[PDB]
Amino acid sequence: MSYRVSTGAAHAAKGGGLVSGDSYSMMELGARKYAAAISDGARAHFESNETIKLLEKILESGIDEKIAIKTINSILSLRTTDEIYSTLDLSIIDLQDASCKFLKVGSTPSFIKRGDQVMKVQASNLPIGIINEFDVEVVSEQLKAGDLLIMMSDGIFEGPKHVENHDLWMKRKMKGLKTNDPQEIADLLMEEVIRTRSGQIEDDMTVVVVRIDHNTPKWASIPVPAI
Amino acid sequence: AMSYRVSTGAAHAAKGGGLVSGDSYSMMELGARKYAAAISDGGARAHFESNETIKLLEKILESGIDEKIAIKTINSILSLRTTDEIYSTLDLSIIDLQDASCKFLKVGSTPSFIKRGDQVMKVQASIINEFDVEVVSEQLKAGDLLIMMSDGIFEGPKHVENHDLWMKRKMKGLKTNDPQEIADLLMEEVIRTRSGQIEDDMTVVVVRIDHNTPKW
Amino acid sequence: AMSYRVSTGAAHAAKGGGLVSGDSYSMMELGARKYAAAISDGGARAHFESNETIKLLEKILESGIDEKIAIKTINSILSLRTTDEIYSTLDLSIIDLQDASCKFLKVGSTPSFIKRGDQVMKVQASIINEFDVEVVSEQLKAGDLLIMMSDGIFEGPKHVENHDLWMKRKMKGLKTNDPQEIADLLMEEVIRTRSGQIEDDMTVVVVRIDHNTPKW
Amino acid sequence: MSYRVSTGAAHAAKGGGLVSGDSYSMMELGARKYAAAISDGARAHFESNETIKLLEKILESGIDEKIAIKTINSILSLRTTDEIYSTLDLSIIDLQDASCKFLKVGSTPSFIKRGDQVMKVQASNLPIGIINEFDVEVVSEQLKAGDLLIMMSDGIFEGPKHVENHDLWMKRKMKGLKTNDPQEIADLLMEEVIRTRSGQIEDDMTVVVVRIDHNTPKWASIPVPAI
Ligand SMILES: OC[C@H]1O[C@@H](O)[C@H](O)[C@H](O)[C@H]1O
Numbered sequence: 001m002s003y004r005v006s007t008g009a010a011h012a013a014k015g016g017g018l019v020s021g022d023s024y025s026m027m028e029l030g031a032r033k034y035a036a037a038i039s040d041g042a043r044a045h046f047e048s049n050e051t052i053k054l055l056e057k058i059l060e061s062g063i064d065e066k067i068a069i070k071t072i073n074s075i076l077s078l079r080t081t082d083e084i085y086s087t088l089d090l091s092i093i094d095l096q097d098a099s100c101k102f103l104k105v106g107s108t109p110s111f112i113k114r115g116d117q118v119m120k121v122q123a124s125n126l127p128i129g130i131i132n133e134f135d136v137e138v139v140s141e142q143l144k145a146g147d148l149l150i151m152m153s154d155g156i157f158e159g160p161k162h163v164e165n166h167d168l169w170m171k172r173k174m175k176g177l178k179t180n181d182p183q184e185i186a187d188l189l190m191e192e193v194i195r196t197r198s199g200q201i202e203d204d205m206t207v208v209v210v211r212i213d214h215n216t217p218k219w220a221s222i223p224v225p226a227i
Numbered sequence: 228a229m230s231y232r233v234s235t236g237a238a239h240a241a242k243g244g245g246l247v248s249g250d251s252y253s254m255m256e257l258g259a260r261k262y263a264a265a266i267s268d269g270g271a272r273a274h275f276e277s278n279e280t281i282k283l284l285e286k287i288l289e290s291g292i293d294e295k296i297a298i299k300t301i302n303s304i305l306s307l308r309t310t311d312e313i314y315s316t317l318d319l320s321i322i323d324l325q326d327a328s329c330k331f332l333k334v335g336s337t338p339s340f341i342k343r344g345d346q347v348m349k350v351q352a353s354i355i356n357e358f359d360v361e362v363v364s365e366q367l368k369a370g371d372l373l374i375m376m377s378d379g380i381f382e383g384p385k386h387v388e389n390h391d392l393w394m395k396r397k398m399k400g401l402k403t404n405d406p407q408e409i410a411d412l413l414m415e416e417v418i419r420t421r422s423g424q425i426e427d428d429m430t431v432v433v434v435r436i437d438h439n440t441p442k443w
Numbered sequence: 444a445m446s447y448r449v450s451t452g453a454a455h456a457a458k459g460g461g462l463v464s465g466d467s468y469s470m471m472e473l474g475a476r477k478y479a480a481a482i483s484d485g486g487a488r489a490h491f492e493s494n495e496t497i498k499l500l501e502k503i504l505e506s507g508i509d510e511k512i513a514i515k516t517i518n519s520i521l522s523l524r525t526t527d528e529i530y531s532t533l534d535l536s537i538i539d540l541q542d543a544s545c546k547f548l549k550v551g552s553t554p555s556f557i558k559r560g561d562q563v564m565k566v567q568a569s570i571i572n573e574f575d576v577e578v579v580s581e582q583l584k585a586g587d588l589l590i591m592m593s594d595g596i597f598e599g600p601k602h603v604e605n606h607d608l609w610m611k612r613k614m615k616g617l618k619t620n621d622p623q624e625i626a627d628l629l630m631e632e633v634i635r636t637r638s639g640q641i642e643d644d645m646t647v648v649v650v651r652i653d654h655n656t657p658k659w
Numbered sequence: 660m661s662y663r664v665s666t667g668a669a670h671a672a673k674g675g676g677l678v679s680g681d682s683y684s685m686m687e688l689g690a691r692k693y694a695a696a697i698s699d700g701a702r703a704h705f706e707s708n709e710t711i712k713l714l715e716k717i718l719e720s721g722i723d724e725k726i727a728i729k730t731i732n733s734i735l736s737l738r739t740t741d742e743i744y745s746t747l748d749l750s751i752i753d754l755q756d757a758s759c760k761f762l763k764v765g766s767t768p769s770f771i772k773r774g775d776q777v778m779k780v781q782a783s784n785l786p787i788g789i790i791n792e793f794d795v796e797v798v799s800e801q802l803k804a805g806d807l808l809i810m811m812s813d814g815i816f817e818g819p820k821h822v823e824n825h826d827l828w829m830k831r832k833m834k835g836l837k838t839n840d841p842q843e844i845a846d847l848l849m850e851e852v853i854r855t856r857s858g859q860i861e862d863d864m865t866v867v868v869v870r871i872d873h874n875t876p877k878w879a880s881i882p883v884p885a886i
Pocket residue numbers: 005006007008026027028034233234235236254255256
């Protein structure tokens with residue numbers, strides 16, 4: 001079955017704010033590895049791929065998204081015959097301002113529950129007029145305190161044995177959620193389709209869910225002395 | 228100016244159920260800066276990884292050698308660091324999600340703590356050690372609670388002669404299992420001992436282990 | 444105190460002769476510091492590689508995109524460097540040993556030169572460019588001679604208004620094909636124009652291409 | 660057939676010596692890639708593996724070689740099932756003082772021609788009393804101006820169809836060398852065994868050869884002014 005971990009953290013800068021000589025990070029290799037690090041003294045403890053780093057750079061600098069798609073596609077071609085033959089689904093949240101960046105690569109789409117308005121993650125203009133070898137999508141939303149972001153592989157977005165518009169099927173099981181708990185939602189959705197064929201599943205299944213919070217904890221309020 | 232925080236969960240099954248899976252998933256978080264999550268239908272190549280240096284330190288960890296040889300060699304690596312490294316202190320916890328073993332690397336760090344039920348043990352082990360490296364492994368159990376910190380937190384409390392003790396007492400006092408709450412409480416406690424004054428940067432990270440096993 | 448220098452050669456054939464080979468070999472040299480050579484009977488994993496940063500710059504090179512997009516992005520990468528990088532100038536030449544194509548990355552560097560027979564061409568190409576990045580490719584030919592340098596060499600000559608010209612003239616004058624001799628001669632020339640005075644650190648690197656094809 | 664490259668370099672430090680803000684390096688992926696870099700401003704342009712880095716650290720710090728062998732062996736086990744299943748033959752020359760370090764891993768031995776004294780690279784005491792899974796050897800010689808160092812894969816150290824002590828066979832073709840040229844020697848040795856079965860070879864063949872030089876070039880003599 002494999003262990004899950006649940007985690008939390010808290011941080012505060014000397015004098016009551018600005019920047020800190022403390023850094024911290026963590027990462028999970030789904031079902032295999034969890035790591036956490038703390039440091040006191042330029043370096044991040046963890047990073048992406050190598051190809052993901054690259055596609056990230058681009059995702060950043062000015063670049064008109066139509067160009068970037070082209071460009072990502074070109075780097076994607078550099079992959080060792082062959083690893084890019086799969087689907088890459090990547091959301092990257094900036095924790096300062098809640099801005100999200102999506103990077104899809106031949107992948108099922110993903111959804112944001114907000115209140116209950118469940119908009120789907122689609123890029124405003126699907127650019128025509130180029131070669132998109134790897135069926136590469138790229139998107140920005142602006143996330144808000146409370147949003148539930150859900151992500152899955154084909155093995156679950158399609159699972160629904162009664163096929164036919166899985167889009168509006170998902171938003172259905174999504175709008176009908178008592179809970180607000182990432183791990184529950186995940187564990188639910190998993191069930192809410194396995195049922196659809198009893199046990200034994202066709203494909204591989206994974207879903208991840210992420211909730212954005214902006215709570216200010218009591219300790220954040222405690223004032224620090226004047227100069 | 229509060230940073231956004233993120234809470235996350237995931238679920239996963241193989242074909243038939245299931246030797247392995249060509250599905251794979253990862254997430255990582257740079258504290259207060261960045262969160263990323265990734266799914267791949269292949270999966271092979273891990274989405275995220277330790278930076279360089281670390282990646283070597285991890286190899287030495289996985290390799291069961293004598294503490295003494297580990298420490299020598301870890302010292303070699305960290306000696307060859309750049310002005311900005313520096314190499315500060317490092318506190319690294321790596322947990323095997325299959326058996327819940329855990330390796331611990333501390334490079335001049337403060338200690339950390341595990342809260343098994345009502346006990347609170349502290350993570351330490353037993354010549355030259357240029358950067359003050361300590362390597363430890365432990366077997367964790369469901370419901371265990373791992374607490375790491377900077378010295379800002381662990382050395383924060385005013386007029387206290389035994390930080391180990393102060394910390395164990397506070398942790399025995401927790402009436403909660405939620406690692407985010409625990410992280411906030413401890414932060415609250417330490418601050419209130421100075422009177423809002425934050426002598427140093429303060430970081431606490433809390434990890435709970437779960438072998439919960441769901442309907443499906 | 445003279446550094447040791449190394450001269451090297453290698454030969455290689457496959458099974459039957461031969462689609463590919465599970466043999467593999469590599470060498471690398473850190474100038475004046477270190478030489479390493481490696482053989483593997485497998486071979487898969489390359490013994491040596493570009494450091495991080497570079498490895499990305501190389502990906503962007505291999506990827507045929509618009510100079511303008513390359514340059515933007517290369518600038519992004521090198522902007523995120525550490526105090527000590529810094530990121531100085533970089534002059535990178537990567538040659539495909541299969542077709543002899545060559546990519547060239549110059550990050551604020553001085554130019555470099557190819558001597559085809561009696562000609563001496565110079566390696567350059569044609570808004571914002573934060574670190575002054577230039578990307579170029581060229582097809583090389585047997586007997587070509589590639590010359591890279593720091594500014595210490597290329598800007599070394601006293602009271603000279605056209606370093607391009609000075610350099611082409613010296614290179615047309617070489618009565619030798621040996622890249623070590625060429626490297627020493629040019630170094631000699633530049634020094635003698637100051638009178639032993641070395642205003643700056645001086646580096647010259649010379650690469651000759653060979654499609655020689657031996658008895659076997 | 661693939662191109663070879665031949666290369667040379669020259670360097671000198673400001674003021675007439677000490678250290679320099681210039682660095683340079685190069686590397687060759689045999690038959691596939693050559694790279695050269697120059698910089699002006701901690702970073703080396705090129706590096707080893709990741710596992711090789713590690714085995715290098717050890718090879719350095721004090722460690723009694725018997726321990727190191729053990730230790731290398733342990734890291735070697737960490738390899739992805741499976742890449743270490745092959746043979747690793749690594750010589751690492753320090754250019755300041757000509758000291759060599761060998762690291763063999765289930766690999767044919769290597770030789771140094773010196774004048775004509777052709778000693779073979781063997782470690783003074785083959786340590787017994789442990790598990791050497793990967794048949795791992797480790798050696799230091801002190802190299803001198805003029806030494807020819809030769810390295811090959813099985814495909815050529817064994818090639819000799821008339822088998823039976825290939826050790827003393829190699830030193831035979833080695834002592835009988837008019838030339839002093841790395842690439843000739845290589846290209847010779849290759850031939851000097853292919854002949855032994857006409858064309859078509861059993862295995863894969865590679866040999867590399869390295870000559871150590873300490874020439875002081877004229878320019879090194881030209882004096883720089885007093886202070
Ligand atoms: O319990 C939630 C946490 O899981 C961890 O594996 C992730 O890295 C993330 O930083 C958190 O969201």
